[PDB]
Amino acid sequence: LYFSRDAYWEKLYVDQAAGTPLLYVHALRDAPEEVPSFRLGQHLYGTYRTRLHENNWICIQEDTGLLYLNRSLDHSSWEKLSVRNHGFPLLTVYLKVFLSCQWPGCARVYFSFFNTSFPACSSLKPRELCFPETRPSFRIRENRPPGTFHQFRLLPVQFLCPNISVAYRLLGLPFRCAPDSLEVSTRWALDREQREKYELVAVCTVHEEVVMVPFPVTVYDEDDSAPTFPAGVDTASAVVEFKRKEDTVVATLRVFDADVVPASGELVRRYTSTLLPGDTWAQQTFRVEHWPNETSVQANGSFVRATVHDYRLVLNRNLSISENRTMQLAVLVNDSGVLLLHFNVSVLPVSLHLPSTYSLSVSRRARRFAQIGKVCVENCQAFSGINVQYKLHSSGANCSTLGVVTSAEDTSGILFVNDTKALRRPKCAELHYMVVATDQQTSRQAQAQLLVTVEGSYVAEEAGCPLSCAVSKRRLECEECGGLGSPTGRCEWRQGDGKGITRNFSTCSPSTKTCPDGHCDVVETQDINICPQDCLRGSIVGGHEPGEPRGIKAGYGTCNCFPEEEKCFCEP
Amino acid sequence: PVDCVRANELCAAESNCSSRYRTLRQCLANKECQAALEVLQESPLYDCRCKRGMKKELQCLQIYWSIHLGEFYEASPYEPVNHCLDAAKACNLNDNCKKLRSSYISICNREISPTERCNRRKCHKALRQFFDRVPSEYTYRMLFCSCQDQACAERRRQTILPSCSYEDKEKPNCLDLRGVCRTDHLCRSRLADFHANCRASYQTVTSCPADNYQACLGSYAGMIGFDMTPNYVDSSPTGIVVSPWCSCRGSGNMEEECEKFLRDFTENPCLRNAIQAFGN
Numbered sequence: 027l028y029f030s031r032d033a034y035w036e037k038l039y040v041d042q043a044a045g046t047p048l049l050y051v052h053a054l055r056d057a058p059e060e061v062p063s064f065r066l067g068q069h070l071y072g073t074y075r076t077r078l079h080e081n082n083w084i085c086i087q088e089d090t091g092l093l094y095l096n097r098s099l100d101h102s103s104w105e106k107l108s109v110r111n112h113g114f115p116l117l118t119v120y121l122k123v124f125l126s127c128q129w130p131g132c133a134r135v136y137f138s139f140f141n142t143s144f145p146a147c148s149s150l151k152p153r154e155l156c157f158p159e160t161r162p163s164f165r166i167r168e169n170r171p172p173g174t175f176h177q178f179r180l181l182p183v184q185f186l187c188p189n190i191s192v193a194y195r196l197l198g199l200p201f202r203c204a205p206d207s208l209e210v211s212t213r214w215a216l217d218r219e220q221r222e223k224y225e226l227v228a229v230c231t232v233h234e235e236v237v238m239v240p241f242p243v244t245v246y247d248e249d250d251s252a253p254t255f256p257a258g259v260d261t262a263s264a265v266v267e268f269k270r271k272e273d274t275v276v277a278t279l280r281v282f283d284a285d286v287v288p289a290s291g292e293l294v295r296r297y298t299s300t301l302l303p304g305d306t307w308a309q310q311t312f313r314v315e316h317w318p319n320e321t322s323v324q325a326n327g328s329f330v331r332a333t334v335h336d337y338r339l340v341l342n343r344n345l346s347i348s349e350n351r352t353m354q355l356a357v358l359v360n361d362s363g364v365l366l367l368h369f370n371v372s373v374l375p376v377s378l379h380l381p382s383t384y385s386l387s388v389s390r391r392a393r394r395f396a397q398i399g400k401v402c403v404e405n406c407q408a409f410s411g412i413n414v415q416y417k418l419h420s421s422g423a424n425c426s427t428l429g430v431v432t433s434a435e436d437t438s439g440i441l442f443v444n445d446t447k448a449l450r451r452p453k454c455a456e457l458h459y460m461v462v463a464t465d466q467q468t469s470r471q472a473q474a475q476l477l478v479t480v481e482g483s484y485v486a487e488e489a490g491c492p493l494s495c496a497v498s499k500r501r502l503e504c505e506e507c508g509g510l511g512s513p514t515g516r517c518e519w520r521q522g523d524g525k526g527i528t529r530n531f532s533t534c535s536p537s538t539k540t541c542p543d544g545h546c547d548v549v550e551t552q553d554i555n556i557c558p559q560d561c562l563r564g565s566i567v568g569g570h571e572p573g574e575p576r577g578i579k580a581g582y583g584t585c586n587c588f589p590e591e592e593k594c595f596c597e598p
Numbered sequence: 599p600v601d602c603v604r605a606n607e608l609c610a611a612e613s614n615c616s617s618r619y620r621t622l623r624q625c626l627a628n629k630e631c632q633a634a635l636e637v638l639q640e641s642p643l644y645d646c647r648c649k650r651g652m653k654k655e656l657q658c659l660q661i662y663w664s665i666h667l668g669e670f671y672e673a674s675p676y677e678p679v680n681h682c683l684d685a686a687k688a689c690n691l692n693d694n695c696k697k698l699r700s701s702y703i704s705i706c707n708r709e710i711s712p713t714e715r716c717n718r719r720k721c722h723k724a725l726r727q728f729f730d731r732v733p734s735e736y737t738y739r740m741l742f743c744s745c746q747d748q749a750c751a752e753r754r755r756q757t758i759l760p761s762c763s764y765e766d767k768e769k770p771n772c773l774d775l776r777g778v779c780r781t782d783h784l785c786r787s788r789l790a791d792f793h794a795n796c797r798a799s800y801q802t803v804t805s806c807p808a809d810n811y812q813a814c815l816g817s818y819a820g821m822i823g824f825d826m827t828p829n830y831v832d833s834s835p836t837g838i839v840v841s842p843w844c845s846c847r848g849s850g851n852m853e854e855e856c857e858k859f860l861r862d863f864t865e866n867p868c869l870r871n872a873i874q875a876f877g878n
């Protein structure tokens with residue numbers, strides 16, 4: 027038992043006599059034992075869940091399902107009931123109907139009342155003689171014994187105007203309009219899994235006007251579909267090799283289901299994924315994430331929808347390097363039909379050796395905090411959740427000149443000049459360092475050779491030089507003076523364009539590959555005089571756009587910066 | 599007309615009314631409920647409203663939803679009352695519109711991370727503070743300005759800055775977003791305010807109740823700055839369809855109610871005719 031709709035519609039007037047039939051109802055059964063009873067709610071509901079009075083004018087026939095008028099109407103009862111609307115205009119009342127307020131356990135019936143009386147038969151258009159204002163829309167389960175769910179006629183219309191010749195007509199369809207009785211029935215039991223929608227055109231014919239009205243039919247679903255693989259895939263092989271992060275999607279698969287019925291409120295409570303136990307290392311390092319998505323599939327030239335569940339497999343912690351294992355994981359799927367999944371996971375350890383000797387040089391004219399070379403593992407861009415730190419050990423322990431800091435983006439170290447005087451000495455000209463590549467989580471480490479040659483000559487800078495490269499504004503004063511961060515000893519000039527506010531802003535940097543890079547690395551952020559145009563937290567004078575954490579993202583004209591006041595200027 | 603703040607004022611001035619109010623509040627938050635109901639149906643708390651932009655609107659709504667008994671429509675607790683270039687120029691020549699305009703822009707145009715595009719709650723707070731205390735001849739002129747080409751429609755779409763507030767990584771279910779909006783006090787009251795003033799009608803000639811364009815426009819613009827915050831769908835010059843950031847997917851058997859809830863924003867002749875007649 028279920029109501030075919032949730033809203034029936036009826037127009038009322040003043041002084042309609044008793045015994046006037048109002049409307050029909052329909053309640054299609056589910057089992058061959060069910061008889062539709064119809065009981066009425068004992069309150070004339072007004073607007074927004076407000077009781078007005080008990081029903082005392084409308085009675086019902088439970089057998090035919092006939093709402094009709096028990097008593098007559100007047101102006102006095104309706105002006106009485108309009109008072110209790112509490113500041114709202116009386117436009118539509120409604121009743122509640124039980125059967126054995128929500129569909130399908132209850133059905134509310136609307137009544138749109140007019141303060142005027144019943145107009146004449148010829149004073150009404152046949153569009154207002156055939157069908158109501160609210161075009162219907164029905165709710166039908168799948169795979170149920172069909173019956174009668176709708177009737178066409180307007181009962182007070184033909185009850186008060188019987189002399190108007192009116193016909194109704196429907197156009198391999200299971201639906202049918204019977205002759206000599208304008209009830210609508212359905213031949214066979216239907217399924218949404220074949221087709222979900224049935225829109226039709228019902229034709230009313232008066233004397234003379236032919237009126238076409240749309241007629242939608244919606245089919246509802248039951249859980250008639252076990253979970254199904256797309257094509258035979260039951261397992262998924264994956265290797266946890268380089269990432270080892272707290273959370274990375276390891277394995278991914280799809281499962282088809284034509285059942286839609288466990289919707290998003292109760293979707294967690296019905297489609298169950300269960301990691302089968304057996305090792306505590308899996309339960310401390312793995313989990314299964316699950317969500318569906320609706321897709322549209324074709325059945326007989328139509329487009330119905332179904333659920334494609336996606337099961338992915340997620341890590342739980344930072345896996346260390348020393349893991350040298352493999353497992354098979356088993357997954358239960360419950361579509362409350364019972365499905366099993368597998369995952370061959372292989373967690374392979376990582377070698378941490380380096381090339382043994384990093385032969386390189388450095389010019390003598392360089393200044394403090396100038397980048398030279400890069401120390402890194404053979405797989406630089408493979409590490410995700412493993413911290414690798416770099417240090418130095420000078421051999422003579424007397425000629426300390428250089429240092430290494432580690433960026434955790436690439437997990438790699440960058441050489442920087444720490445001292446000027448030790449590089450300035452002709453004694454410490456070829457230096458031998460033990461670059462030791464360490465680790466934080468598990469103390470596996472390695473080491474390597476660093477030979478560096480102090481090469482070139484030394485020339486003093488100018489008399490009025492500032493301490494940073496970006497103080498200069500023109501091109502000549504940039505390269506004829508030396509700032510801090512450059513390993514060349516002089517500052518470099520990059521020249522932009524006249525295309526307005528661009529990223530290509532003309533400036534003076536220490537290195538044209540490092541300072542206007544758009545990234546503030548570990549080297550530049552040590553002391554804020556090196557690269558102010560990538561690492562400042564300050565104010566900008568001129569049309570520009572600042573960087574996303576910090577810095578100048580785009581400028582106009584020439585851009586110089588005073589890092590002593592955290593101020594920058596941009597002007598052609 | 600007694601608002602709920604003064605209704606609580608007259609409620610706290612009496613002993614029986616306060617007793618039945620706190621009794622029903624301990625009931626909600628048999629016979630104890632029904633006696634309190636049949637007493638408090640004559641209270642000044644019964645049928646108390648609130649105001650738009652009033653001081654302590656939150657307490658008024660928390661009092662009003664406290665007496666409410668526990669559904670597509672609900673009762674509104676309120677008083678039932680180049681072109682876009684010129685709109686922005688008319689804003690920037692006044693001082694009150696300029697300050698709050700630059701306030702919500704300089705808040706909502708601040709990217710934090712490469713992942714987090716903007717801060718959500720501060721942007722919504724700035725947009726609410728903009729659309730509460732600005733005279734409505736400035737808000738409606740900038741949000742509703744008639745266009746003929748694509749660039750005007752793009753400026754009109756970018757006016758509430760949808761890159762931070764409107765769009766998200768996904769389009770969730772509209773029914774879930776309705777449940778989230780009806781969990782909160784303010785969003786549920788603004789949604790009931792929109793439902794009471796912007797339904798379609800078969801009797802009135804403009805399909806709007808009381809033929810009131812102003813109440814439907816105020817009920818529209820009062821939803822800005824919440825999770826159910828609508829905007830345009832594209833940069834169409836003439837095609838004007840507003841929508842919240844959701845869709846009909848994931849609906850299950852609740853598809854028809856989701857479609858009917860979405861047709862309030864997508865296919866409302868009342869709201870579209872109100873926008874068109876305001877544009878004339």
Ligand SMILES: *[C@@H]1O[C@H](CO)[C@@H](O)[C@H](O)[C@H]1NC(C)=O
Binds near residue numbers: 318
């Ligand atoms: C679901 O599938 C559609 C297909 O176009 C896609 O756009 C959407 O991102 C998918 N959503 C999820 C959560 O997978």
Ligand SMILES: *[C@@H]1O[C@H](CO)[C@@H](O)[C@H](O)[C@H]1NC(C)=O
Binds near residue numbers: 350375376
């Ligand atoms: C991992 O274990 C296997 C077991 O035979 C061994 O052969 C292999 O050398 C181990 N991995 C490393 C990096 O030592």
Ligand SMILES: *[C@@H]1O[C@H](CO)[C@@H](O)[C@H](O)[C@H]1NC(C)=O
Binds near residue numbers: 360361362364
């Ligand atoms: C699936 O869930 C239902 C609901 O609790 C339960 O009765 C059934 O036993 C479950 N399936 C399995 C294989 O346990």
Ligand SMILES: *[C@@H]1O[C@H](CO)[C@@H](O)[C@H](O)[C@H]1NC(C)=O
Binds near residue numbers: 261262263354369
């Ligand atoms: C997963 O491991 C099992 C264990 O023998 C094996 O039979 C199966 O073929 C493996 N899966 C794949 C895709 O090779």
Ligand SMILES: *[C@@H]1O[C@H](CO)[C@@H](O)[C@H](O)[C@H]1NC(C)=O
Binds near residue numbers: 343410411413
């Ligand atoms: C995992 O490693 C990352 C790498 O930096 C680290 O930031 C994070 O705190 C680690 N988390 C845990 C739970 O170990």
Ligand SMILES: *[C@@H]1O[C@H](CO)[C@@H](O)[C@H](O)[C@H]1NC(C)=O
Binds near residue numbers: 444
């Ligand atoms: C650079 O030199 C200073 C002073 O000699 C010292 O404190 C600092 O630790 C050095 N840098 C590194 C990375 O060792």
Ligand SMILES: [Ca+2]
Binds near residue numbers: 168216217218248
């Ligand atoms: Ca079926």
Ligand SMILES: [Ca+2]
Binds near residue numbers: 250252286361
């Ligand atoms: Ca299923």
Ligand SMILES: [Ca+2]
Binds near residue numbers: 247248250284286287
């Ligand atoms: Ca199904």
Ligand SMILES: [Ca+2]
Binds near residue numbers: 541543545546557560
């Ligand atoms: Ca840089």
